[PDB]
Amino acid sequence: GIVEQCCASVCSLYQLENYCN
């Protein structure tokens, strides 16, 4: 999930962009 992928570990543009509408 996003907190696991971007808080608990380092985020990426790819990940953030998967949550954009």
Residues near another protein, by CB under 8 A: 1-3, 6-13, 16-17, 19-21
d(CA 15, CA 12): 5
Choose among another protein, Na ion, none what residue 17 binds, the Cβ cut-off being 5 to 8 Å by kind.
another protein
d(CA 7, CA 21): 21
CB of 20 to another protein, least distance (A): 4
According to the binding rule CB under 5 A, does residue 9 interact with Na ion?
yes
Q: What's the token pair of residue 9?
A: 């570990």
CB 19 within 8 A of CB 2: yes
Where do contacts with Na ion occur on this chain (CB under 5 A)?
A: 5, 9-10
